Amino acid sequence: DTFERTGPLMEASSYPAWAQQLINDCSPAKARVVEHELYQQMRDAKLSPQIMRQYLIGGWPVVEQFAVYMAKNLTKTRFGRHPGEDMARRWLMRNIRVELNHADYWVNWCAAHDVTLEDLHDQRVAPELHALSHWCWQTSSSDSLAVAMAATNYAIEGATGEWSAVVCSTGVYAEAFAEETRKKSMKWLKMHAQYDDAHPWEALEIICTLVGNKPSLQLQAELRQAVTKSYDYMYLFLERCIQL
Template sequence: MNAKYEDELEITPHNEWSQKFWDDLIPFKDRISQHPFFLNMASGQLTLTSFRYALLNFYPLVAHFPSYMSLALAKATNFADPGVTESRNWLIQNIKVEERHLNWYRDWAAGFGLTVEELDSVKPNPAMNGVNHFLWSNNTRGNLAQALAATNLAIEWATGDWSSHVYEGIQTYADHPEIHINKRTIAWLRAHAHYDDIHPYEAMELIKRLANHDVKMQQQAFEAVKEGLAYYELALDECQRVHELSLKQDKPVAESA
């Protein structure tokens, strides 16, 4: 094993195709990070009902994330191909990190009044669950570049963006009598808003190494990112729909504390 890799995956400058790949995806990523639901979440405009709905129904995505990555890891077997060994090592390192995030997410949900039993028994509706089905399918049927693109670039890139805004505004919810904000309940947000934001850049670096001389693979990875973000957006549209319905019966947290 490459000892240097264990310390850090070097991020290299983009070449022509990878720079276009990255730039062309920014508008699709921004549809997630700037989605009205996350803007409302960051500004304290969600009702407690809609916040809980999102935490509950996005839980399977967080809980299964290490499994999606494990499916990608199973594809990293041909070490003679460029980027495969680096992808294998990176996935092994970060699967354990994602497992730790599950516990932090549970703490966040607990701070908003959800139990572990509720989380573990949730059955999201199709709009919320589509992203999970896509990631299972993509990581099972796609190649290694597609798997990294959909999971570690699409989902982690957009999540790092919106979580930084929500982290900045999370104290807006602190005065609500049914919400408890402390270091444990914001650990997931803090991680994704700060040190974990390197993950999508590392995923892009791995995609570059895997697909640098394969135009078809480049296009497959690009489409995997777009499709993953599209399913993410469907889930957020559903969260926003539930939020708008909840406003008929309740006030935003910022107005009801």
């Protein structure tokens, strides 16, 4: 049967029971990322420039290609075919524009840590760190619109908002930068920490409208595995950086 949200957008209770189950099943994998030691050290301006460097260089591929993932998912949509598809169409068209200067913001954050655009092109980091980007590519290329959006717009942007909030929570990290260049350097983190917390809930609403209230157990497992894969690749990336 068809899903239509009745309750408030940012309450798990407003979504179908299978979706609530998915949120609970994937919560430990999300926690591993959000509560990670790396972000706690970064927050407190105690994170080694060696780790910071690997983080900033390795993190670039997903940052650079985010709108390309979204553009690939948009090519899956058709007008007036399904209500979920029409929501996805509109939302992806709106949010591709939002990502406009995000790559430039990352380059600016990098510059504050003496990471050049040339460093971002060269990608002289452990291949392990590129796994998330390859996964984002494949899902947005070949998986269903719902599975693909669960993996990228829901899982990545959801976790990103939570850990960037952790990193900005004390103000210690920001105080470590010069007053004059602070705004420019902290821009990428401020956008993701001070951006509508509704964002992943909008994504989840679209996913549920696409799959409906009674999806197959096979589709449920595919959705659970896609979300978990994104969180797990994010955790493995963090673990690899902290190993240095």
